Amino acid sequence: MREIVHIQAGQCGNQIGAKFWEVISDEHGIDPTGSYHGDSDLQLERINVYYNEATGNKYVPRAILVDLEPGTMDSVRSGPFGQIFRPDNFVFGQSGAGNNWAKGHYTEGAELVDSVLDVVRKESESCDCLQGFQLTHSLGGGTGSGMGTLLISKIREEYPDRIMNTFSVMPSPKVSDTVVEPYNATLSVHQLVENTDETYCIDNEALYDICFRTLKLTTPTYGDLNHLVSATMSGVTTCLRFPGQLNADLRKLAVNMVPFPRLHFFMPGFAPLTSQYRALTVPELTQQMFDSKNMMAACDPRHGRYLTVAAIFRGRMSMKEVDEQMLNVQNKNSSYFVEWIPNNVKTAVCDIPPRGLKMSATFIGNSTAIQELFKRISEQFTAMFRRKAFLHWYTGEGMDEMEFTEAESNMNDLVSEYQQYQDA
Amino acid sequence: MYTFVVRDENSSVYAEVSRLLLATGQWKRLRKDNPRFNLMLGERNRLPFGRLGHEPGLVQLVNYYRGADKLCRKASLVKLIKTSPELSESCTWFPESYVIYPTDEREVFLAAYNRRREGREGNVWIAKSSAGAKGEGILISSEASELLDFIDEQGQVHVIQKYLEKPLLLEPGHRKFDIRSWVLVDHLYNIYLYREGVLRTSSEPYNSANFQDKTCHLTNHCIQKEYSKNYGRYEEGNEMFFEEFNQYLMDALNTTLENSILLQIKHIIRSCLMCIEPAISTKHLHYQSFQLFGFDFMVDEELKVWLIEVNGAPACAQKLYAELCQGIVDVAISSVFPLATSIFIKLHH
Amino acid sequence: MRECISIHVGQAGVQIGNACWELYCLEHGIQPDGQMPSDKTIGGGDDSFNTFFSETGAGKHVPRAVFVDLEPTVIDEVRTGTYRQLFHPEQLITGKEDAANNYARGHYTIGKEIIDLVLDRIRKLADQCTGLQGFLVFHSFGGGTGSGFTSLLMERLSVDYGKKSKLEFSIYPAPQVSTAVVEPYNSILTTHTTLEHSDCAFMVDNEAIYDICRRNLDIERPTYTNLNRLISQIVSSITASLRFDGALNVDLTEFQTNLVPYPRIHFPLATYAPVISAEKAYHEQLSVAEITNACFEPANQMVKCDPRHGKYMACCLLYRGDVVPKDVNAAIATIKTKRSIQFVDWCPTGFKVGINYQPPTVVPGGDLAKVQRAVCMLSNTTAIAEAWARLDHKFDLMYAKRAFVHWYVGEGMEEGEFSEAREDMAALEKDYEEVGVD
Amino acid sequence: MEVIELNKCTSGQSFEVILKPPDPSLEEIQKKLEAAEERRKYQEAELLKHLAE
Ligand SMILES: Nc1nc2c(ncn2[C@@H]2O[C@H](COP(=O)(O)OP(=O)(O)OP(=O)(O)O)[C@@H](O)[C@H]2O)c(=O)[nH]1
Ligand SMILES: Nc1ncnc2c1ncn2[C@@H]1O[C@H](COP(=O)(O)OP(=O)(O)CP(=O)(O)O)[C@@H](O)[C@H]1O
Ligand SMILES: Nc1nc2c(ncn2[C@@H]2O[C@H](COP(=O)(O)OP(=O)(O)O)[C@@H](O)[C@H]2O)c(=O)[nH]1
Ligand SMILES: CCOc1ccccc1/N=C(\C)C1=C(O)C[C@H](c2ccccc2)CC1=O
Ligand SMILES: [Ca+2]
Ligand SMILES: [Ca+2]
Ligand SMILES: [Ca+2]
Ligand SMILES: [Ca+2]
Ligand SMILES: [Mg+2]
Ligand SMILES: [Mg+2]
Ligand SMILES: [Mg+2]
């Protein structure tokens, strides 16, 4: 019951997804070979949300690993927890996607997508009651971006009433692989606007700035960025994976967090982020959680307004103190919550802390300030598209300029729709 | 930090209270429709009391007592005084009054009137209404038929009241007046009488023979400025304050303001507010109330004090806003929401 | 003897129902296995407690109850809990996937597929009844199942059992104990659709129960288990007249007769006293005068509101424990001289009193101390409209921006049902005002 | 202050004290449910049409 099917696509999607499974396998007591060796039946009460139980008391991630080249998945298979994944769930091609949304969505990815859906269908059919899908991917490349959104469209066709949530890494010129990332991201965002229920926007510049300024890492790597993402993903999903206050499937959660269908792009954060054995008080946890420096979309929440907010606290702490502190941040931030959604700040506590911390807090904001992220992408897109720069990479795969024009308009409409609810 | 909302822009008192709260640096004003406030400076009419005290974790305070209108409506005050045994139909400090509709007391009103004029007694009455503002819907007359015919012309319910035919007259001038006292009732139902009151004086000689010129008979500030050509002659703005009035009583009548008048005023304020306390107290409620009241009194030539009306949303005398509004913040607001020699007389009970 | 069937819908309805039947068993001397040693008629009934319990030939006493949820984890706790032997499997109905806090999903999408099965299981209980009086329906306002499927069940119950009374125990939504945001929508939608089908409805605001548990039970952070045990005490006080010998409120019809002069205005206010912490070492027992006076404190009401600023249409006093009529009347006389109690002009200023000599039963190991006497007051006061005004205002705020509306339209509901329901609530607020203000 | 209707039994007693004297058919439900199911089906058909484009 309430099984989730996880999909990770492309280089970024698989490297972050692998870290996610390392983190929650540790929390659930599952060793790198799928055997349970924990000390508490709380670790197993909801283990089925993310794991299948194979005979021999082995637990197998309900995870599908997709790429258009073999390199990253070879690395996953050799990784720390590489053995826990079902071998049949590695679906990969050989050509690559050349950081090209069109190859991922229209040519190379189109050839591979049916076999991915075969594995999805096989995992779904073994679910007592599938509650939905999650995808990890970046928007700036070709496989995660183009083929990932092709996958989402195909899943919506085959499973039209299943929830689809994403953890989506947004490109930034400061943490960039190629100049075409704004093209790929803009084309992808319109797919997400139509076909996901919640999209967690993780901006690579925010991750970099946190590593550099807060964690005092002089030269951050993708691995350092990915440790922030897997820890955030663990926190965001804490209430599905462990007993606690929330008795909610993905649909109930989306119903209460998404007041308008297109405005489902979430700003996540968590606390603490520290460079260490010091105890964090509830005031400190609550204050850091709402601080823009602890959020991961590189948007200032004071530049917009919160439609809905959820916060998950992990560890043994005073519920009464949590309530008091959540009221203190709301009165300091009273301007920044819409007054036409009553009681739009919700909290949940889970007694089980993450590894290495006595307590932590995860933040889920649906804020109109996320429009700043789409404005950045739109600007970078237009700066090149105005001169049709680098377009030949896409027209060579059969796309024409009109589809770029339409993706630009769709993103500017999304920005415009955020601005209208920020002024209400 | 504390949060408050303003919903009566026309309040001179609470525009000044709101100004003081900001100048503290510990109060923040929100939009008028933000429900996450600590203090509501509410609207005069249809204040949504049913929505207060349901915001989790916020202690909520409002500057009006739900139910205090019974004291602050003319028809309602008459019914409260006649039917409450604490006050009773024999209450010695409220003029004989009757409620009349165009229940109704028209037959009882004429009954006491018949005994009055038949006995060659003074039979002048003043008919007034709550819905009549600016001193327009007032009629003073000794003929009952004229009073009753006047009421049916106007649309609203009216109160006919014995007109104090022997009022204490200030000298020189042979002139009428009324006393305004400001009373603050906090969330604990302490009753605080502001030590400063004001006399709203007539600048015309009182003329018992002719009631048609209402200017010498009506002490309203708007009426004296509008119609009395002697406005401001004896005192600025036809407002005399307690130091002068007390000095006058000492020089002329060899008595004090405290002894001859203020003991009765305190007695009357206490009686009215103690009467309705069970109906309006917020002591064990999910939100708290305070309210500022304006009591209006008349004094006769025997130095007997009579209650005239109670205003639930009073203004203040110009030269007293700073002191009283600070006192509201001190006693009524900061007492619930503390921040990081007293101007009130506490009437005990 | 006339049977009553209890129906528990959604998480709140199921968990409260579980708490109520536990208490009923304690009050009637029924063990968790269904046996009842004091019942000397084996397999045969006609006693007052048989209005709620049927009997098997093996002598087990089975609740006349149906539990229905669109998702199984709450009813699974009934299936494996202390009183699992009480219920037979056919009384416990579960779906695969819940209504996601969406009225339209509980009413239209999922309700359509399970309503006939639920009515079939209810019919099976009705067939064991020699003279069914009607139904007691427990549910939340805020849940998708509690609101959406309840309104559908209530409509079909009016069809299939047209001459039967239906009473509700409804949990009114409180932000302190809810992680949902759309509950004002579900509450107005279900109240609009259920209004004509409910003869009498007892609203319990989780905010009031939560604060009573904090102040009187010294529970810093009350849980659903704390709230439900308190709620079950109040429910037991209200249903005790149906389960024990007596002459007041002995059938469901009497609830409407004594408490509801106007059909639409059928939401009596419940007030309960005393609530005393069991952890409290030294406690002085409260008198009849003291618990009766406590019935006029807003802090003891199931819904926070101010009855001093409304008018009463009916008032019922339900005492359990060491109480005699003489002390009730002495207490009433003193309270009438000290408190603002105004009735409407077309009703007598009076109190219907019932006294049951058995003091309240409390769950062993629970939060409530045993007391020598307790009282539940049921008053139909126009002050409860304050709770409608609160809810309607939160509705208006969200609906002016059409926030969350697409979730409901997406399940096949039309936007016009929102405004149709809100207009019904506007008429209801107006009805209370016409009755209660001069 | 009058007591009336005093009834007494072994379990307790009841009385009154006075201070002062003074639907849709089954077919219609089915219509509603089937109409909503059809609006769901029409919305889904538009989604599937949109995906087919
Ligand atoms: N007093 C009390 N309230 C509850 C309980 N469970 C849920 N609630 C309240 O009910 C509302 C949520 O509705 P639920 O009953 O959980 O939802 P549901 O009826 O199961 O319908 P679904 O949406 O399908 O899950 C919130 O206001 C909760 O605070 C309970 O056990 N006791
Ligand atoms: N019974 C009476 N005898 C003598 N004078 C009277 C009287 N009733 C009223 N007055 C005079 O009429 C004036 C205004 O009366 P009233 O207070 O009823 O009107 P109002 O409410 O519009 C002014 P305010 O709001 O400041 O009290 C008083 O200042 C007083 O001088
Ligand atoms: N945070 C993070 N970002 C990555 C990682 N790998 C690539 N990226 C970002 O993802 C985008 C490139 O997409 P990538 O996943 O490598 O291409 P794909 O394999 O075709 O899907 C760029 O914006 C990179 O900055 C990673 O491991 N972590
Ligand atoms: C209705 C309010 O809900 C909450 C209230 C308080 C605290 C946390 C809450 N939880 C939310 C919002 C939530 C979500 O919206 C979706 C999250 C998710 C995302 C991606 C994959 C899987 C799960 C899982 C998840 O806990
Ligand atoms: Ca190929
Ligand atoms: Ca095929
Ligand atoms: Ca028997
Ligand atoms: Ca009916
Ligand atoms: Mg790459
Ligand atoms: Mg006035
Ligand atoms: Mg449920």
PDB file of C-alpha atoms in Angstrom, chain C residues 288 320-324 355-357 359 372-374:
ATOM      1  CA  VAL C 288     -24.371  20.021  41.675  1.00  0.00           C
ATOM      2  CA  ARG C 320     -24.759  11.314  35.635  1.00  0.00           C
ATOM      3  CA  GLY C 321     -24.000  10.357  39.218  1.00  0.00           C
ATOM      4  CA  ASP C 322     -25.078  11.529  42.646  1.00  0.00           C
ATOM      5  CA  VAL C 323     -27.739  14.090  41.703  1.00  0.00           C
ATOM      6  CA  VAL C 324     -31.271  14.657  43.020  1.00  0.00           C
ATOM      7  CA  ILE C 355     -30.566  12.150  35.799  1.00  0.00           C
ATOM      8  CA  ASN C 356     -28.830   8.793  35.521  1.00  0.00           C
ATOM      9  CA  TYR C 357     -27.598   7.552  38.886  1.00  0.00           C
ATOM     10  CA  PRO C 359     -21.589   8.133  37.638  1.00  0.00           C
ATOM     11  CA  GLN C 372     -19.046  11.643  41.733  1.00  0.00           C
ATOM     12  CA  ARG C 373     -21.318  13.619  39.401  1.00  0.00           C
ATOM     13  CA  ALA C 374     -21.175  15.114  35.908  1.00  0.00           C
TER      14      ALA C 374
END
